[PDB]
């Protein structure tokens, strides 16, 4: 409004409209700042930066003003706490214990009641010392190093190799002897691995709360939980590699060696990869919604009446508790997002929705580490490739999905040999898209699976005949017709061949083609048409 220098009634612009509107407004200021026709590329870039910077600083000053602090609302009977800010409402939700310990200032961390962390005072103290080391790492990670980790997740690089590179760079640059201080606090920790395992384990009415604000607050809780826990998992992996390099402060040990290697490697693989997959999933309606808010509204919320009933709440008389219910909802939603549910629905919904891209990227980020819904992911990815026009990759993905066909309800609903039923489904799809060459190739493969079912073989060979005839492949259509085991369908295909070749004036091929005992069927057909038709001749009589 201020950059435009103009009293225009701001329409309630959609956000996309607002983005286009910002872009055009700043581009116009840049074009006005370019006085000469011969601006060097460097001088042009400098002018671009200066103009966007100026727009950004202006948004900042308004955001500061709207962010100004109001007051507190506490509900006496429900204990709901709200922070009233100048521009928006915030809700205060109880923090989980893991997040509490990571986020509390180092000075207050020394006054935590160890009895709340664990009934075990020593486990409580070890968790406290571990959390202090994680924070000493967190405090020395440069932005370049934080980006290098997040880039590695996005590019599906190994987060472990990247945590190791970050650790090499931290050590090359250890000007403050921090590595010595982390080493000293780790020496005060009695069982760093139990404390690591506790952290990893704690990190592992439908109409009600159906509003968009409630949806956004709940899904932002998920984003912040997943981001904090992603950093905890990165620093925990770098610390775990340091603990391995420092552990060589001893001989490997056979008993310790075998036990530690199998147990730790299995637990760890089932740990860092799972955390990375959860973070990727978290990263993945006139209101702006996130893809997680969309999934919550369309799929996850419909299951909440069941989550509420399974918990022994068979007494309709228990009062609603906010703390218990939000914690349960958020944990159940993490399991569904976290690629640990057989729901097989967010990806399918994306495939059946206008958006497909985001679904390809969601499946790309999920498949390497999540073993839940793998068949359903390949099915969704196959739909995305089919819409992208990449039909061969789609077929490979549909073929991989078929293996989770065991104990599968979605594929069972299509039926109310399994491979031949699947190929018949893909054949219908390729026919509706209008790809007759691929229909012939797939129908030829499907004849191999049809083994002893002469009826399916007759139907598939009749389909091959039809598509070759439609394409004008007269020799291949004739060859396909001779292979039909059903004499009734073979005669109907023969009638179709004779008619289509006569209409196309391809009379030479028709003469060459060696009809068996059916030379008089042709004469009878042409005679029936000839006498039936009017005197105006064409070429049936000829």
């Amino acid at each position: 409004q201020i950059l435009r220098k103009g009293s225009g009634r701001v329409l309630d612009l959609s956000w996309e409209e607002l983005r286009k509107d910002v872009t055009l407004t700043v581009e116009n200021e840049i074009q006005n700042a370019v006085i000469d026709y011969d601006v060097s590329q460097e001088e042009f870039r400098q002018i671009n930066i200066e103009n966007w910077c100026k727009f950004y600083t202006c948004c900042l000053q308004y955001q500061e003003t709207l962010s100004r602090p109001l007051a507190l609302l506490v509900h006496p009977d429900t204990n709901m706490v709200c922070l009233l800010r100048k521009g928006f409402l915030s809700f205060l939700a109880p923090c989980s214990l893991v997040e509490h310990l990571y986020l509390v200032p180092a000075e207050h961390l020394l006054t935590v009641d160890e009895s709340v962390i664990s009934d075990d005072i020593d486990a409580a103290s070890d968790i406290v010392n571990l959390i202090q080391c994680l924070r000493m790492i967190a405090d020395y990670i440069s932005e370049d190093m934080a980006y290098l980790m997040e880039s590695a997740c996005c590019h599906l690089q190994s987060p472990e190799r990247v945590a190791e590179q970050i650790l090499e760079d931290l050590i090359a640059n250890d000007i403050d002897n921090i590595m010595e201080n982390i080493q000293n606090k780790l020496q005060d920790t009695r069982n760093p691995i139990r404390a690591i395992g506790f952290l990893l384990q704690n990190m592992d009415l439908s109409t009600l709360y159906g509003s968009i604000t409630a949806s956004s607050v709940v899904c932002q809780a998920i984003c912040k939980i997943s981001a904090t826990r992603f950093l905890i998992c990165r620093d925990l992996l770098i610390l775990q590699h340091l603990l391995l390099r420092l552990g060589d402060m001893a001989l490997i040990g056979a008993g310790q060696l075998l036990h530690s290697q199998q147990e730790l490697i299995p637990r760890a693989a089932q740990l860092l990869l799972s955390y990375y997959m959860i973070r990727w999933g978290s990263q993945c309606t006139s209101g702006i919604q996130t893809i997680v808010e969309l999934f919550f509204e369309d799929v996850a919320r419909k299951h909440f009446p069941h989550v509420f009933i399974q918990s022994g709440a068979s007494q309709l008389q228990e009062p609603l508790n906010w703390s218990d219910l939000i914690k349960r909802i958020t944990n159940y939603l993490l399991q569904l997002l976290w690629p640990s549910n057989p729901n097989f629905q967010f990806a399918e919904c994306l495939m059946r929705n206008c958006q497909y891209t985001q679904l390809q990227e969601y499946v790309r980020l999920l498949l390497p580490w999540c073993q839940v819904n793998v068949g359903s992911c390949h099915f969704m990815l196959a739909q995305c490739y089919l819409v992208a026009g990449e039909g061969h990759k789609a077929l490979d993905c549909f073929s991989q999905a078929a293996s989770e066909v065991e104990r599968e309800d979605f594929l069972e609903k299509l039926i109310r040999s399994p491979r031949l039923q699947y190929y018949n489904r893909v054949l219908r799809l390729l026919e509706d898209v209008g790809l007759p060459e691929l229909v012939i190739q797939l129908a030829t493969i499907a004849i191999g699976e049809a083994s002893d079912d002469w009826r399916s073989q007759a139907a598939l060979r009749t389909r091959i005949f039809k598509h070759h005839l439609d394409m004008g492949h007269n020799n291949q259509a004739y060859d396909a017709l001779t292979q039909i085991p059903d004499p009734s369908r073979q005669l109907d295909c023969l009638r179709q061949l004779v008619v289509v070749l006569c209409e196309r004036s391809q009379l030479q091929d028709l003469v060459e083609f060696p009809y068996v005992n059916l030379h008089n069927e042709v004469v009878g057909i042409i005679e029936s048409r000839a006498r039936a038709v009017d005197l105006m001749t064409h070429n049936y009589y000829e």
């Binding site: 286009k20 872009t23 055009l24 581009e27 590329q41 880039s151 996005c154 590019h155 497909y356 891209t357 390809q360 990227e361 992208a388 026009g389 990449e390 039909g391 061969h392 990759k393 509706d432 898209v433 209008g434 790809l435 007759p436 060459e437 394409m471």
Partner: protein, 321 residues
């Protein structure tokens, strides 16, 4: 629906077709087309170039066994048919996610090199140097990669979505255009390895983009159902946006002889793939052709003539100027 002006029979299905955009020193225009397992190099001469030709003289010069379905073909600028030192060089992408560089003397010396490193399907590739030493490729791994002829990766740009088309800038050194499936067109400087600028399409998915060789300020693309034109540096917003096809546009190519003429193709569809030739001064296509199932679209270097590959045929449309 106009019939094709000329039609040439092919051994198998044509998955991609590209005219040589460079001067090969021959009277005929070189054409490459990719089948299921082969690449054919042919010479085309047209009655419009030589009055001694009745219609189209089509001569197969060489066939290369590929073993995989070819998805994109790029000509090298070094390609020459001169009798003193004949050199054929082109690059191909296939369904195996590999690039193959073919080199031939049109005699007995036939070499190919395999380049590996894309983790997803390659959607498009081009030679990105005037000297023909460097290849740019884009794919479903969300990368744009630059390769030498030795198959060493020189550079890599991380994309935000699948790269759908790549084009070298016709006059400006070091400028690569990359079209992303989510509607973003980015320009990269290959000297600085930086993104210079982006354009955004109003529709998605963005499927193909091309530079106007006659007016290097114009970019054309297809996204969703529509064709989209930008004029640089005036705006990041489209200058024109109009319907190309009733169901999904696939390829966009600028005419090499006219800055106001371009061709679009519909997606490999049940209604036989339509080719639409557009002129910017007209609200409707100037020509609508039908190809039963066709992939690849290329323009002749000199003539107002475009080619589309189909089921065992090449189809040519001459546009009256």
């Amino acid at each position: 629906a106009s019939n094709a002006t000329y039609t040439v029979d092919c051994e198998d299905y044509v998955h991609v077709v590209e005219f040589n955009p460079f001067d090969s020193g021959e009277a005929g225009s070189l054409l490459a087309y990719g089948g299921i397992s082969y690449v054919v190099i042919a010479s085309c001469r047209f009655q419009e170039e030589d009055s001694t030709v009745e219609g189209i003289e089509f001569k197969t010069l060489k066939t290369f066994h590929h073993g995989e379905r070819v998805v994109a073909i790029a000509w090298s600028p070094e390609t020459r048919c001169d009798a003193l030192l004949p050199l054929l060089r082109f690059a191909t992408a296939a369904g195996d996610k590999k690039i193959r560089i073919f080199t031939s003397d049109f005699q007995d010396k036939n070499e190919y090199k395999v380049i590996e490193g894309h983790s997803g399907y390659i959607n498009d590739l081009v030679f990105c140097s005037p000297e023909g030493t460097d290849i740019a490729s884009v794919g479903d791994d969300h990368t744009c990669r630059i390769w030498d002829l030795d198959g060493k990766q020189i550079a890599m740009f991380i994309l935000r979505s699948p790269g759908m088309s790549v084009a070298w800038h016709p006059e400006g050194a070091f400028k690569l255009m990359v079209a992303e499936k989510t509607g973003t067109i980015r320009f990269y400087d290959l000297t600085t390895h930086q993104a210079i600028l982006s354009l955004e399409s109003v529709q998605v998915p963005l499927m193909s983009a091309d530079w106007c060789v006659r007016n290097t300020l114009r970019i054309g693309a297809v996204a969703g159902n529509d064709w989209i034109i930008w004029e640089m540096p005036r705006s990041s917003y489209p200058q024109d946006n109009k319907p190309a096809h009733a169901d999904r546009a696939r390829m966009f190519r600028w005419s090499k002889c006219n800055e106001n003429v371009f061709a679009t193709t519909g997606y490999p569809g049940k209604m036989k793939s339509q080719i639409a030739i557009h002129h910017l001064a007209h609200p409707q296509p100037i020509l609508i052709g039908t190809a039963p199932v066709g992939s690849g679209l290329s323009w002749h270097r000199r003539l107002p003539l475009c080619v589309v590959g189909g089921y065992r045929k090449l189809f040519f449309w001459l546009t009256e100027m």
